[PDB]
Amino acid sequence: LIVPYNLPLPGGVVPRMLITILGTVKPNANRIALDFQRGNDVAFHFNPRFNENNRRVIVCNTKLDNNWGREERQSVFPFESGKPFKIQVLVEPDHFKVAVNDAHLLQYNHRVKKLNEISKLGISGDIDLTSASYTMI
Ligand SMILES: CC(=O)N[C@@H]1[C@@H](O)[C@H](O[C@@H]2O[C@H](CO)[C@H](O)[C@H](O)[C@H]2O)[C@@H](CO)O[C@H]1O
């Protein structure tokens, strides 16, 4: 799949919806980004950064009307340059739950409440995208 890749989510997101992304981090990778979009707004921005002040950190945020909000940062960094990964985003009623390589990583409380209007997922960054899909559990 060509990155940046756009995965349309017909009818928006809904609890019990599971998105699975498989890929390989490029060697010398700098960043990865998943953008759950509601029109121009970004409902949930998941952004692993490989070198932020020589620190590997995951930044999560929401962008409303061209403005980024309060960042939520995670130190647990499970991605590795040059290695295959699997990211699963499970949509729950109150949060997006993220697990990487089968290990729960983080939860992101819904700032954008109209879930049915979050109808696109943008995937970009320094990765080789192998697969991107969704299902209902
Ligand atoms: C430490 C700190 O506050 N750093 C922020 C940067 O993280 C921020 O970068 C933007 O962050 C958003 C997510 O919040 C998104 O990843 C953008 O791509 C990225 O540019 C920057 C701009 O808001 O400000 C710094 O101070």
Report whether 14 contacts 87 (CB < 8 A): no
Q: How far is the CA of 32 from the centre of ligand 1 (A)?
A: 14
Instruction: Walk across the sheet containing 103-109 and list its strands.
Output: 103-109, 95-100, 84-91, 17-25, 127-136
CA 97 to chain CA centroid, Å, is 10
Report whether 11 contacts 116 (CB < 8 A): yes
Instruction: List the alpha helices (DSSP H) in 29-117.
Output: none
Which positions make up the binding site for a beta-D-galactoside? 68-74
Enter the resolution in angstroms: 2.1
Instruction: List the alpha helices (DSSP H) in 2-120.
Output: none
Strand ranges (DSSP E) for 9-102?
A: 17-25, 32-38, 41-49, 57-64, 67-68, 72-74, 84-91, 95-100
Give the dihedral sign, CA 79/57/99/63: negative
For 89-123, letters b (16+ CB in 10 Å) and e give bbbeeeebbbbbeeeebbebebebeebeebbbbbb
Q: How many residues are present in the chain?
A: 137
Query: 């509601």: which residue's tokens?
Result: 38
The answer, yes or no, to whether any atom of ligand 1 lies below 6 A from the CB of 47, is: yes
Ligand 1, residues 62, 71, 73, 74: which to mutate, most atoms within 8 A of Cβ?
71
The answer, yes or no, to whether any atom of ligand 1 lies below 6 A from the CB of 62, is: no
Select from 3, 37, 39, 36 the least CA-distant residue to 19. Answer: 36
Q: How far is the CA of 16 from the centre of ligand 1 (A)?
A: 30
3-class state of residue 117 by DSSP:
helix
Experimental method: X-ray
Instruction: Report d(CA 44, CA 2) in Å as an integer.
Output: 21
What structural domains does the chain harbor?
1-137 (2.60.120.200)
